[PDB]
Amino acid sequence: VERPASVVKELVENSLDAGATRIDIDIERGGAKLIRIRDNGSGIKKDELALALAIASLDDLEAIISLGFRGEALASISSVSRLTLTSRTAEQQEAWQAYAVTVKPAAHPVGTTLEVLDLFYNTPARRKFLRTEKTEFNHIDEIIRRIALARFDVTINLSHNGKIVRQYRAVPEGGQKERRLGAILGTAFLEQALAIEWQHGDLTLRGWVADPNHTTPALAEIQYFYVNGRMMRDRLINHAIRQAYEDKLGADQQPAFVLYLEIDPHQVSRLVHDFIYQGVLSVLQ
Amino acid sequence: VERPASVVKELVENSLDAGATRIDIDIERGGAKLIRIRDNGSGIKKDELALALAIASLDDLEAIISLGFRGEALASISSVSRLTLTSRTAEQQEAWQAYAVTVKPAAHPVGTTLEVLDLFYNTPARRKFLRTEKTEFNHIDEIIRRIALARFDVTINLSHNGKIVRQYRAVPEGGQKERRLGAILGTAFLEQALAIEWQHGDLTLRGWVADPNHTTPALAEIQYFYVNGRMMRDRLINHAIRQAYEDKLGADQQPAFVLYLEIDPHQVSRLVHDFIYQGVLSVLQ
Amino acid sequence: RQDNLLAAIWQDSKGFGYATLDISSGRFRLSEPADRETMAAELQRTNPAELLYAEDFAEMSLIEGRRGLRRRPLWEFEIDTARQQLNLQFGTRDLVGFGVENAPRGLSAAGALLQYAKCTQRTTLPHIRSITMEREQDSIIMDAATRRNLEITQNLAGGAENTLASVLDSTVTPMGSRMLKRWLHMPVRDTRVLLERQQTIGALQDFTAGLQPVLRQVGDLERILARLALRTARPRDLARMRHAFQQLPELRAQLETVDSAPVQALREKMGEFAELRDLLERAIIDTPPVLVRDGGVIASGYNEELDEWRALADGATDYLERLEVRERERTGLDTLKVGFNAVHGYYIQISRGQSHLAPINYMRRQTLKNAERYIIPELKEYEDKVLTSKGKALALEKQLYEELFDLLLPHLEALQQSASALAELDVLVNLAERAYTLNYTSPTFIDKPGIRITEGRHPVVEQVLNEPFIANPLNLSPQRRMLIITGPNMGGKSTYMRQTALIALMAYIGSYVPAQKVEIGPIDRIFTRVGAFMVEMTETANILHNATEYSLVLMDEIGRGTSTYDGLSLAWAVAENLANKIKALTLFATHYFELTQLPEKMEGVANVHLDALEHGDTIAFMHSVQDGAASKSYGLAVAALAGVPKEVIKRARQKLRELESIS
Amino acid sequence: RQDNLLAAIWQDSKGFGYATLDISSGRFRLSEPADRETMAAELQRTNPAELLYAEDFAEMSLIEGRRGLRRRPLWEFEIDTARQQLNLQFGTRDLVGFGVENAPRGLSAAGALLQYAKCTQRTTLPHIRSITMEREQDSIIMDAATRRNLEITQNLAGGAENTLASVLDSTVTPMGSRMLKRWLHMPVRDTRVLLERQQTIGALQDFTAGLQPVLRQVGDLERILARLALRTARPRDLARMRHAFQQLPELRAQLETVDSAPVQALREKMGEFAELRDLLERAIIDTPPVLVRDGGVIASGYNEELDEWRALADGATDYLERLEVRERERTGLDTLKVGFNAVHGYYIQISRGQSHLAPINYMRRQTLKNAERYIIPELKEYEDKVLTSKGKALALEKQLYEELFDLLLPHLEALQQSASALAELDVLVNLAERAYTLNYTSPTFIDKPGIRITEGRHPVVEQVLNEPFIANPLNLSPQRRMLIITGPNMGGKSTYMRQTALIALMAYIGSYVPAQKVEIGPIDRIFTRVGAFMVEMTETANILHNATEYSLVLMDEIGRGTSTYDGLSLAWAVAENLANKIKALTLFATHYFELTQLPEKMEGVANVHLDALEHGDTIAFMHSVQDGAASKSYGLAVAALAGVPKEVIKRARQKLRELESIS
Ligand SMILES: Nc1ncnc2c1ncn2[C@@H]1O[C@H](COP(=O)(O)OP(=O)(O)NP(=O)(O)O)[C@@H](O)[C@H]1O
Ligand SMILES: Nc1ncnc2c1ncn2[C@@H]1O[C@H](COP(=O)(O)OP(=O)(O)NP(=O)(O)O)[C@@H](O)[C@H]1O
């Protein structure tokens, strides 16, 4: 957990893993000063709070640690911060809260909220690994943009220094996907976005691609492809895509695309290349 | 009581007759809108209030009207106004107050205060006759200036439409009388004021006279002479004064003077003139 | 079936003061008709049988024909006489409690009316114990208290910081911000005007992104129009203004797609003025200076003569240089400079050391510290032509500028309304943006006085709050018109009260509201009395004297007496009057627990409270509204939160224990 | 015999933040030394055994030599980290109650100090429960509350109306009004400075009349000096300024007679600057215009060349006329006019009908609708010389003006202080006038904290009040240091409280006071908390945390809980703390009658009250202070006065009767 963005990766995954449909995020000063992720999914009980931070004390708890995959990630984070937790489960209950050394009740909706203050308190170096506040937030905005595209069904609201930055609304059952796409990637891509939908049996290719004739260097930074919702970047897939732009028009310039490959679980398969190459080439013609 | 100045004459005499040492006066709009005289002398009891406004009603009172020569002046004034009285006697008591139709208690220092709202309240004409505002107040300022000179031992504070106008301090036991003289008559007279003190037996002449060589037409308006505190104006006394200016310097211009004659009461006497003529002539030479 | 009334009337420079009375009923009323038309309409409406008028009444045409005419003297209409006399009858010293303190034109009319009645009756009239004004504006209401208390545009200390306006006013131009401020001080009742704005907010919600960038480019058009009427507008005023016109083609294009009749009407009122746009593009250089005195405003080609004069002046740059080089190389003196001075004019400067090596032709102009300056005939001739041409070029530039006003003022009428349209658009676009961004919903109106909120929140606090703001439901009607709010301090009483007032105003300006769903009826007047005793009692009376079934009333912990008993005694009798007689919609927050018996006995009353839970070394405010009353007094808990040492706290708890175990 | 203390330090742009601690005692302190000298003096004073400093600490010379030096990283001095961490220990969410909220420079130092102590101890330190700042000026301080509450220069709503300043500030010039405002926000403790002002007020009381008329003629000299430093002063600034110098001879004459060393020192600091006076009288015309651009500023004779250029220009008026007459009579054409135009220059105009009768020599210049304008060589030559001479005359006028700054700026030092002297005089003369006019007396000082008033009055209210203001005696000392004030509302509690605070400030600016006689001891801090609950408790704590024996405290009806018991329970425990531990001088106004048991049990405490008398359906307030307690609660009397209907009043009386006959 070197950057703030890697700590955000972890806690944002934990919230979505609890079935969260609204993940509202408030940051200050590149994530150094304050970070707040709140999820309205399933919460944690009064028993599972205190021990998820703090080791022969496990003697009389009796395997509650098991229900806390996320509870593991906390321990690595909370030992090196002034972590301030608060949460409430769905069932008849009042919200609870831990500190610093003293746990006590609080008020919170059905879900979980976390607060992190100013890290490194004994390291001369790991602090001196600060970059910039503005640039750290640009990597947060990057990783949020990555995970935003991977999950269209979750409302993500992002703010920084009070100032609200982004507002991704959630997709309902089979909803209008255009409004989310333009909000994540701005005006430039949405106007030249050409849809692609390809399928031979188990292989399925869903997504969007910019028109090669009207693509600029600014548009070319948007290059993401997903394998069952997890973002991959392999050089054989890049080949299928760039060769397809090359053969339609002579201008072999950096393409702009957002693609989802959906297959059966294996580590990845030659038809994979041919399926992708023919998918994009058909849409351009 | 045609003018406001004549109503002031009456109530101001009544306050001084009660042994008042501070008479504070607040006016608004030439005396039409508001007039307030407060005296801190002897007050009137709760018994002597009600019947002093409202005459076979004297039937069950038992001769309290005797203590109320002032009580008579009220009746003439209050029948033709919205008179608002309040007062308290010297011994342990609460102040009392009458209106309009309803008499009740109040809070006031040892003394008497009176409030008058545009005296005439049933006459359409007699109010409408009442002349200007600025000019009425100039006759008030005049009559105040007359009575101010007659009593140096009484503090008189005068205000109008919020604006505080004049502030005559009372003379303590054998005090500096210069501060009062300048405040009443301005800087002009005080600088040229020559003192006069003359006496043959019963006759006593006290006061001040301006130096004839440096007297202007503005100074010449100050022409007052008193007979045992009461201001008189006879042609024989004017003769003694002006003949004295004539014989000293050839410039026979209007004199500026403030003089007090003190004698035994008889209604009218040639030594009166010679005593006065020689008194002033001696001071100039 | 119609009234046998008495009336009194007068006029000053500004308008008319009017008063009416029914001596058989004790109903005593007042008004201030602003114009001659409303005055003529009010006379017809009331139908007085006798009329008192001032002898200085100018417009005799309003009254000549009316029955029961009585000419009155001027002295009777005195303002302060009226004040004293009315105070004498009601037994007050001031009239703040009657809600007519700020209406002296009406008060003078009542003062004269009063004197007449007394003299005609010559009987006491205790059946007349009050007065109320007949208010022209049926649309909109707010007393002094509410305007400041809610902090719409002004926080209570005096500034503009962290108000309602501060959060919602993310507009892009000053005139839009100003129009917003006027509409917030003016919520309208006409359901149809509100439906313009609701449809519009719904139709524009998608197009927020594309339009606001373009709106910013306008600048402060509204205030520039003031300076055009005065003949004082500046070149940089025109720079932005010109730039604003160039966006109107683009704006006309984007607005055409918005399906809304209010929008299409505004898009036409907007315009582009292609003719006046072209004029400024040709007549002025692309980036002008601040003032007209400096010149360099007018672009060349537009005027032939301006170019000519500039040619004489622009024949400077090339001419001066040729002389400098020729003279420097001729003499062999390297410190030879051709420079300019405002007092002495152009010159040839030579340094002190080289001064004695100058040519004979050089006439000395100016002697200095480090140098001697000279003049020659060639330079002196050219000096005169340049200064005179510059003078004439600059004088012409000032003349042409003034003549531009003459030709533009003919369109002044259409341009003022173009600016009013643009200000309205910035307001409404900002609103469509705030409704989407801050998660609001579309409300509906109803027949009867009543409010039903689903998941209502406080619009400013919920965003500025760095914790979960707990949304709360509200259910009110004519059958549920009064709520007894018990609970702890910092429980969220005032917040849940004030969020209701803010929510209501948003609905009556046509905006979407922070809730899942909202229904709301007609509301005639909004009243407020929040803790800062003279202060308290007079304002409560005012609310009592003027309220009706439609009235919204927000009481924040009133009923403090000069002791414990008397204050509560009042609060009980007060709520009775509001619930039983007036039947107004009321929220009554308080700490006196005994009031919670009312819901059993008074119909249309129920107990609610802000719930709190005590345990361990602390307390947890749920911030949720519940049916029922508070558990206890939480004063000892609140004092520790403010910052009090334990010495005092511990003494208080021990002492409280003694007092509670007396009985 | 030396204390073994810990300290922490750092610096930003503005100054230095400092903190000190004794871990054996639990005493925790803060400070903000403003400059290098005070900083070096504070280090010496405290004598720390160990010192934490920031790695960006620039002026290392202050700390290099001190013992126990520890270099700290920057991140430890974070302001909001300090806020959160301090809040965690004390168990608060904010630090308003500790009175260090607006001292972030100090707070950052404590935040770093805090983290070190925890690491060294590795034990809880509950013996440290608080913090207080060491405030530099031992001459006095006022909190936020008192400044606004008393309405010194600002009424509570926000304006300047009917304040203390409004009654006392009848000064004649703006800079005196401004200096007055600074001195009211700054009452001084040094006995000697107050005695300057007392002798002065006594010595000048007669001469009020002769001096204020002369002071008015000065104008705003102070702000003109700012614009002289910036090189932006205007001609009418100099007009008043010059007029101000002409009064200094007269002022020097009148002040010589005043027997007072402070006065004679000021009379010297004043000066007259006879040399600079003569300069402006000769250099500028008697009545100048507003700006420099117009010209007509510099007077003739002062400059030979300026006169020369004006002769060419002033040769206009007589020259133009001669040509007009000659040409009109020569041709026999009566419509022949000589006029001027800014664009085309001078011309000879002839009407349309006569145009064909013009001479041969006339060259046509400008053609118009109803006339033709011509030009001749004689007029065209003269045209160029006039415009160029005007330009040079005006350009010379602008140069001479700029050169006047160069010659005046060398006296700038003495002139700034001359202006400071004159501002002080307007303040003091105004004060000598107010003391005489409003009937004030000379007070005296004492050793120990105590106040003894004879016939004390409220200085603003007594004059604005349209009735007799009842003066009241006050007797306070270390043996009588707390008064329990019971009584009715509008009895005069807050007034008699606030008159005491206003009276005290007048004494500590050196002024005479509205009373027959006054004695007063030293006062270190003045504290206030008046009703507008979170609001209330935090502020009371601050007063508790920071008070001493010398402190003035004015509580106005605090101790409102979330019910009846809890609020009183606090008020009791509060007064105990003040009376027993702090021993401060206190006035405790309230409505809870049970407090009146304290004087029996607590030494230095006694009962007082505002007395009132009840009868029928009304009440009479005597407004006089009495020993003892109130008769009853008078809330029922007060409510009627506000304007409440009898329905409510009757219910309250019936109900009150039940409650009073329980017990
Ligand atoms: N010494 C006095 N002389 C004359 N009138 C006075 C005097 N003291 C007070 N009053 C009047 O009494 C009223 C009450 O003053 P105040 O002390 O504010 O009452 P309170 O008990 O503090 N209640 P509140 O005004 O509600 O805060 C004021 O309106 C004054 O006009
Ligand atoms: N619905 C809510 N959700 C979240 N926080 C709330 C809510 N309502 C109130 N609060 C917070 O709780 C505090 C208490 O609110 P408030 O209504 O001011 O109490 P109160 O009864 O007015 N006490 P006082 O100010 O002494 O009269 C406020 O400062 C809010 O920040």
Author numbering:
A (entry chain D), B (entry chain C): 20 to 73, 80 to 125, 132 to 299, 315 to 331
C (entry chain B), D (entry chain A): 128 to 659, 670 to 800
From the article:
MMR is initiated when a MutS homolog binds to a mismatch. Upon ATP binding MutS releases the mismatch and travels as a ‘sliding clamp’ along the DNA helix, and this specific state of MutS is recognized by MutL or its homologs. Once recruited by the MutS sliding clamp, the MutL homologs activate downstream repair. Here, we trap the transient complex between MutS and MutL to resolve a crystal structure of the MutS sliding clamp bound to MutL.
We crystallized the MutSΔC800/MutLLN40 complex in the presence of DNA containing a G:T mismatch and the non-hydrolyzable ATP analog AMP-PNP (adenylyl-imidodiphosphate). The complex crystallized in several different space groups, diffracting to resolutions from 7.6 to 4.7 Å. Our crosslinked protein crystallizes as MutSΔC800 dimers bound to MutLLN40 monomers, and does not show the MutLLN40 dimer arrangement through crystal contacts. The crystal structure shows a novel conformation of MutS, in which the subunits in the dimer are tilted across each other by ∼30°, compared to the mismatch recognition state. Meanwhile, the connector domains are rotated by ∼160° around a hinge at residues 265–266, which moves these domains out of the center of the molecule and packs them against the ATPase domains. We observe nucleotide density in the ATP binding sites of both subunits in the MutSΔC800 dimer, and since we crystallized the protein with AMP-PNP we modeled these nucleotides in the density. Although the complex was crystallized in the presence of DNA containing a mismatch, the DNA is not visible in the structure. This could be due to smearing out of the electron density over multiple positions or the DNA may not be present in the crystal, both indicating that the mismatch has been released, as expected for the ATP-bound state of MutS. The subunit tilting has occluded the original DNA binding site, but because the connector and mismatch-binding domains have moved, a large channel (∼35 Å wide) in MutS has become accessible, which could easily accommodate a DNA duplex (20 Å diameter). Moreover, in our crystal forms these channels are aligned between symmetry mates or even within the asymmetric unit.
